[PDB]
Design a binder for this molecule. Structure first.
Ligand SMILES: CCn1cnc2ccccc21
Ligand SMILES: [Zn+2]
Ligand SMILES: [Zn+2]
Length: 582
């Protein structure tokens, strides 16, 4: 308690000595409360005019237009201590899983140099605005690194002064760049050295890319076993227990010297004890603490969510296979059975899963898994939108399974080769491309963001009639040489000025390990669509009068946007499609 967090608390107390007060009408039950101080400030979603002008038919579709308009009573809930059988299963499984992940990897510190390179190419490293303007400025000034140094030596001394969270089914915890560096130094290796790659973790998909996820699910489908299960957890980050945080910390067992001590301090001082500042309109700032739940960097959050989800799902698999009888207590011989299952079949069982943070797909040995719920519920990983003890409903066809907000189609090219393509409801794709975040966007910057969405559609969603047409229109309306941009950056092969057919050939043919015949495609007309009825099922407007008029008159829409941007060099990409080719 207050020995580990007191210093951070004491320090903030004094910067607002003229405003401190223990409020008696504080709304926290599960968060420990400490005091308040005076503040007064808030970032809504803005429309991308280039994309909206080239998607007119969607101006009258509420599922699109409502996306651009406009639970913190889950962060304030509590999770019970698991039983001794559950705690034992998790500790054995975690111990075994860090060793497998560590067999072909070496833990190591990430460097000021690596951190600097990140900030100078815009990665979302959740920092704050004070002393320096942006992240870019702090990194070049040696004053910063002295602040970093002071805290660093403080962590080696087992103490913390400035690693404090700021709060803002989503909840983001911005720290100051200094605390973010120290997190990156100790734990960045998990992401930087791809510990959750499929090659390394067998269940993971880190670095895999949307054009690979469908092929990975089809490979899992080829295993003998039961249905494919894809149960979502209700508020995964809120259900991370202190026992979860202690099994995650065991990665330090594989470290040495300084690194081991630096990593131990991050886990002890910032993860297993937290200090947070929250905006309350009644507007004051609340300084609240708690020991459990996830509140880390988004990138470290991803890897440890993947880790603990892999652990939970292997245990749910053990329960289905009858490896242990009850979570109340493991007998001595159940421990050796669990250990022996892991050594004997653990790697096979990891390969039956696709896990991306809190998101999983499992193809278990048989359907006993569906009603194996005691460990899953007792670990606190309670399923969303089903009653606690109701058996899971599985999927009989890998093409129906949801994963990373998509489903996947099997699409046969006129030449017989097989594409496995990512898909989701087309209203969601159009609605997202019509939104920008933040202020001060020039027309050129807005156009270059439209171009990023268009090239993503040409590479990932070419099989959707409306998106291939809208992508060609946007690429025709934005100057040919203007570089696609994004303010918050899987593998993003569409972020390039290279010809999109050349990039399509590299991603789907040359570099695709599921495509044996490497014959290049010579034109976009060789590249197939979904069936017309399947395209409508997945949200296409093909067949509507609005869509026909848009497609026929597309050059008029392209010319409207070209006239706004002005006298620039443009390319006509519409004749790459059969219907505009004379
Ligand atoms: C886990 C054991 N088991 C297997 N099949 C079931 C069906 C309902 C309840 C429990 C079941
Ligand atoms: Zn600290
Ligand atoms: Zn679809």
């Amino acid at each position: 308690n207050l020995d580990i967090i007191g210093k951070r608390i004491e320090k903030i107390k004094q910067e607002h000595e003229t405003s401190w007060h223990y409020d008696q009408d504080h709304p926290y039950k599960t968060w420990a409360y400490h005091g308040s101080y005076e503040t007064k400030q808030t970032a809504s979603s803005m429309v991308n005019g280039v994309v909206r002008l080239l998607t007119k038919p969607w101006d009258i579709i509420p599922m699109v237009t409502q996306m651009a308009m406009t639970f913190k009573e889950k962060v304030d809930t509590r999770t019970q201590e698991p039983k001794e059988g559950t705690k034992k299963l998790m500790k054995i499984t975690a111990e075994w899983l860090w060793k497998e992940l560590g067999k072909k990897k070496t833990p190591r510190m990430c460097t000021r140099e690596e951190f600097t390179r990140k900030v100078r190419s815009n990665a979302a490293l959740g920092a704050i605005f004070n002393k320096w303007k942006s992240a870019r400025e702090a990194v070049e000034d040696s004053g910063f690194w002295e602040l970093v140094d002071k805290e660093r030596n403080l962590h080696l001394e087992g103490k913390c002064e400035t690693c404090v969270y700021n709060m803002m089914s989503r909840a983001i915890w911005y720290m100051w760049l200094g605390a973010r560096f120290l997190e990156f130094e100790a734990l960045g290796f998990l992401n930087e050295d791809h510990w959750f790659s499929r090659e390394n973790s067998l269940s993971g998909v880190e670095g895999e890319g949307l054009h690979k996820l469908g092929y990975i699910l089809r490979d899992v489908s080829k295993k003998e076993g039961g249905a494919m299960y894809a149960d979502d957890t209700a508020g995964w980050d809120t259900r991370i227990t202190l026992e979860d945080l202690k099994n995650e910390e065991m990665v330090t067992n594989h470290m040495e010297g300084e690194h081991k001590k630096l990593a131990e301090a991050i886990f002890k001082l910032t993860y297993q004890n937290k200090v947070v500042r929250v905006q309350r309109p009644t507007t004051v700032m609340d300084i609240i603490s708690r020991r459990d739940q996830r509140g880390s960097g988004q990138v470290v959050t991803y890897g440890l969510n993947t880790f603990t989800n892999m652990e939970a799902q292997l245990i749910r698999q053990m329960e289905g296979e009858g490896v242990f009888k009850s979570i109340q207590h493991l007998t001595v011989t159940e421990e050796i059975a669990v250990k022996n299952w892991l050594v004997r079949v653990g790697r096979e069982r990891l390969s039956r899963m696709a896990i991306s943070g809190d998101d999983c797909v499992v193809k278990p040995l048989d359907d006993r898994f569906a009603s194996a719920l005691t460990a899953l519920n007792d670990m606190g990983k309670v399923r969303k939108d089903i009653q606690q003890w109701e058996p899971s409903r599985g999927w009989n066809d890998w093409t129906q399974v949801p994963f990373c907000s998509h489903h996947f189609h099997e699409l046969i090219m006129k030449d017989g080769r097989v594409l496995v393509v990512p898909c989701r409801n087309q209203d969601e794709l159009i609605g997202r491309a019509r939104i920008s975040q933040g202020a001060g966007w020039s027309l050129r910057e807005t156009a270059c963001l439209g171009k990023s969405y268009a090239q993503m559609w040409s590479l990932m969603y070419f099989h959707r009639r409306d998106l291939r047409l809208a992508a060609n229109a946007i690429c025709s309306a934005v100057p040919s040489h203007w570089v696609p941009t994004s303010r918050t950056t899987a593998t993003h092969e569409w972020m390039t000025t290279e010809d999109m057919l050349t990039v399509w050939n590299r991603v789907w043919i040359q570099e695709n390990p599921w495509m044996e015949d490497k014959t290049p495609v010579e034109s976009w007309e060789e590249i197939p669509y979904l069936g017309k009825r399947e395209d409508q099922w997945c949200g296409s407007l093909i067949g509507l009068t609005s869509r026909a008029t848009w497609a026929k008159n597309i050059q008029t829409a392209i010319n409207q946007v070209r006239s706004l941007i002005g006298n620039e060099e443009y390319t006509d990409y519409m004749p790459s499609m059969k219907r505009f080719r004379r």
